[PDB]
Design an enzyme around this catalytic site. Structure first.
Site, short mmCIF file in Angstrom:
data_model
loop_
_atom_site.label_atom_id
_atom_site.label_comp_id
_atom_site.label_asym_id
_atom_site.label_seq_id
_atom_site.Cartn_x
_atom_site.Cartn_y
_atom_site.Cartn_z
N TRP A 133 12.55 -16.86 -8.77
CA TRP A 133 12.10 -18.22 -8.41
C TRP A 133 13.28 -19.12 -8.79
CZ3 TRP A 133 9.18 -21.50 -12.32
CH2 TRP A 133 8.69 -22.67 -11.75
N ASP A 214 6.39 -13.45 -16.76
CA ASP A 214 6.04 -14.72 -16.08
C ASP A 214 4.80 -14.30 -15.27
OD1 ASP A 214 5.59 -16.97 -14.74
OD2 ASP A 214 7.59 -17.29 -13.94
N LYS A 250 -2.31 -21.77 -9.19
CA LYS A 250 -2.76 -21.03 -8.02
C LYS A 250 -4.10 -20.35 -8.19
CE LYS A 250 1.38 -21.85 -6.42
NZ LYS A 250 2.58 -22.44 -7.06
C1 LIG Z 1 7.12 -17.03 -10.62
C2 LIG Z 1 6.67 -18.44 -11.00
N1 LIG Z 1 6.68 -18.90 -12.27
C3 LIG Z 1 6.38 -20.15 -12.68
C4 LIG Z 1 5.69 -20.95 -11.77
C5 LIG Z 1 5.33 -22.40 -12.13
O1 LIG Z 1 4.05 -22.77 -11.65
P1 LIG Z 1 3.39 -24.10 -12.26
O2 LIG Z 1 4.42 -24.81 -13.09
O3 LIG Z 1 3.15 -25.01 -11.11
O4 LIG Z 1 2.20 -23.76 -13.05
C6 LIG Z 1 5.50 -20.52 -10.45
C7 LIG Z 1 5.17 -21.51 -9.32
N2 LIG Z 1 3.86 -21.16 -8.76
C8 LIG Z 1 6.01 -19.26 -10.06
O5 LIG Z 1 5.94 -18.84 -8.72
#
Ligand SMILES: Cc1ncc(COP(=O)(O)O)c(CN)c1O
Ligand SMILES: Cc1ncc(COP(=O)(O)O)c(CN)c1O
Lengths: 401, 401
Positions: A133, A214, A250
């Protein structure tokens, strides 16, 4: 003044660019495959029912808006650990873990990165998969660590370069930090199979690396919360004390409410308390205390049997629509007379898919079909619906024939 | 494992210590003057009516939970700058400011500190008043800046050491950074008077220092939004392009929702867009995007005349209650036959009051009167009610007579 004369315009964000160009389109047939959030069959944002119920419960209680402890809402952190580790996990039951509420997944990763910068004296190197990412980079870099990479995605087969991965990890200096996506790899959708995971555990164990998981798509990837957390749970059971970031963005559709947590697996409860104290010292001067809303919602759902139950049905529903679009895209491409191998589309997991399409094709796709996506051939499956999957397959065929 | 064996348990918070002791006390007359949030006359947490109304509104509209832009909710940031600068402000009207949503005042302060660390090439020194809010130190320190101090509080008179401040400020190397509390200085309650602020502004201008305003109590200090922002507005008017952190924790009782904003006054609208692009680059890898609940409530209040109107009455009530308690405390100390000068009590502004009580006196108040405060003689006026102000007067008299 003139304090800022030298501050230059920052680079434009691509993803941002596609969305915008998308809006600026008249074709009623236009598709936005750059959307980073889940969308229902009508192309609409989806607030879960269990979420609306939780909100109604909170509203009814007339709760206060007093600051949460630095580490966050206790019901939340514990429930969060339990979701991740599993109820009968030894790590959970012995209390040899510490979980602090973070600002969704990103804030959690950052707090985690800052913690390692401060206390992980063994190394400054963080090994990311190739690719990872986009945000992963600045996160660690800004935190003060050095980035490295291990082979992961195989562009030849749009699948996992298992051999390269194994070879790269085997040569990673001992006590280095390695970041692993628990499931639904972003941005490729390529994940290791249970059997390859067993093998990675072993090298990680042998090399004595600190595994940073993660986990942003638990339950959301396959529709099964236990299956999605299999790898994480396997490493721990193998005696690898990992660190982890969780997101409810999500999986609970809490996007903007920002609920997440950072967890450290320690040797014992006593060590867990020392670590917790230091995590609090680090966060205070970052943002003081975390936002209460998303955490209150998530905690209700996780801790209320009836809501938790409804949640699993809804998460599964989401996972299923995604898998369905993947399946339908491949079937349609075949039916179109496409002779290429598109099985990677179905072998992939989660919302993001590396299609293998080339830049000029993406461009043709954008120019002639009003299908917007990034030039890397990555599409957000969330942007595909029952009503347009046909059009999409058709277009892809035209550009690739 | 064995990664964290060298992590030491961090030092404990003294304020926490005071709160725990307070909680353990069984004397029904016990007072908690270590409290960091407003409390009503009944000693209870207070969620404003306009807040409940704004919340009901959100609910009614069945809003989504989609991610906010990195910079936050546009309606919120705009209203935020307008609140701070004033609607008829040249700075505001010309759009030469950039405001980004932050995680309350703290996150906003940190984003600002990180921004300067990165782009303020002129210096690394941040001058804080003696004393300042405890968190200011680590905020700046963690960001990578160097801390300096300037005389502020005069223990002799429990007021402003105008001579020392002026002497200290006059020797600050040009282009250094100076932190100023807009109003309701934390933790003494001692604020410069208009004439004093005019002199401070002149030296800041002349020595070409970057002024960083911490505005955490706008409207909550004196009950008037305009008067509370007077000094900030005066600096800008005099041609000093400041940086500013705003918190809605107190003024709107949004505590746990974490609504705040960071603002940079720029040369022009052009320069503002560039700086804004750089702030976005900084924030993404911090937490990606801000918590939406607090911003939504805040925006609605500020942007809906009916609600904004009600907010002003409510914030005024809060302010008045505190003043009232300060007044009543002084009056009762006289009534008790206190021979001392307790003027500073009524001269001070906001939630915190530096009483002048010595460490041994505090001990007695705690030990014998069940009045909990920190050893610095600092009291939170929020812990005082119409029902106990008399007792406090009594107790102070006894330990200082
Ligand atoms: C692999 C990964 N890690 C971290 C995140 C961060 O997500 P959020 O900060 O919006 O909770 C995401 C984004 N959906 C992600 O795809
Ligand atoms: C001077 C000062 N600045 C910054 C803050 C931080 O406030 P918060 O993070 O809760 O919005 C506060 C606390 N109200 C304050 O007293």
């Amino acid at each position: 003044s003139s304090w800022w004369s030298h501050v230059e315009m920052g680079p434009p964000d691509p993803i941002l660019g596609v969305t915008e160009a998308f809006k600026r389109d008249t074709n009623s047939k236009k598709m936005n495959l750059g959307v980073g959030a889940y969308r229902d069959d009508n192309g609409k944002p989806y607030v879960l029912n269990c979420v609306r119920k939780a909100e109604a419960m909170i509203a009814a209680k007339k709760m206060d808006k007093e600051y949460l402890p630095i580490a966050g809402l206790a019901d939340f952190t514990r429930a969060s650990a339990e979701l991740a580790l599993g109820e009968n996990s030894e790590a959970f039951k012995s209390g040899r873990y510490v979980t602090v509420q973070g600002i969704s997944g990103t804030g959690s990763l950052r707090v985690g990165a800052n913690f390692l910068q401060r206390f992980f004296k063994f190394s400054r190197d963080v090994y990311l998969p190739k690719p990872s990412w986009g945000n992963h980079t600045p996160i660690f870099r800004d935190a003060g660590l050095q980035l490295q990479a291990y082979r992961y995605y195989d562009p030849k087969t749009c699948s996992l370069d298992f051999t390269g991965a194994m070879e790269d990890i085997s040569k990673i200096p001992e006590k280095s930090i390695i970041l692993l996506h628990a499931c639904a790899h972003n941005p490729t959708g390529v994940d290791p199979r249970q059997e390859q995971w067993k093998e990675l555990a072993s090298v990680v164990k042998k090399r004595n690396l600190l595994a940073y998981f993660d986990m942003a798509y638990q339950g959301f990837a396959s529709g099964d919360i236990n299956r999605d957390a299999w790898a994480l749970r396997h490493f721990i059971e193998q005696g690898i004390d990992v660190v982890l970031s969780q997101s409810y963005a999500k999986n609970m559709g809490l996007y903007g409410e920002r609920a997440g947590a950072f967890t450290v697996i320690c040797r014992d409860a006593e060590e867990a308390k020392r670590v917790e104290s230091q995590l609090k010292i680090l966060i205070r001067p970052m943002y003081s205390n975390p936002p209460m809303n998303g955490a209150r919602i998530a905690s209700l759902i996780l801790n209320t049997p009836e809501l938790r139950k409804e949640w699993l049905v809804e998460v599964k529903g989401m996972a299923d629509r995604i898998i369905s679009m993947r399946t339908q895209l491949v079937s349609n491409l075949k039916k179109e007379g496409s002779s290429h191998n598109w099985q990677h589309i179905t072998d992939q997991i989660g919302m993001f898919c590396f299609t293998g399409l080339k830049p000029e094709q993406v461009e043709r796709l954008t120019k002639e079909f009003s299908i917007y996506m990034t030039k890397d051939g990555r599409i957000s499956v969330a942007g595909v619906a029952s009503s347009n999957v046909g059009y999409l397959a058709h277009a892809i065929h035209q550009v690739t024939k």
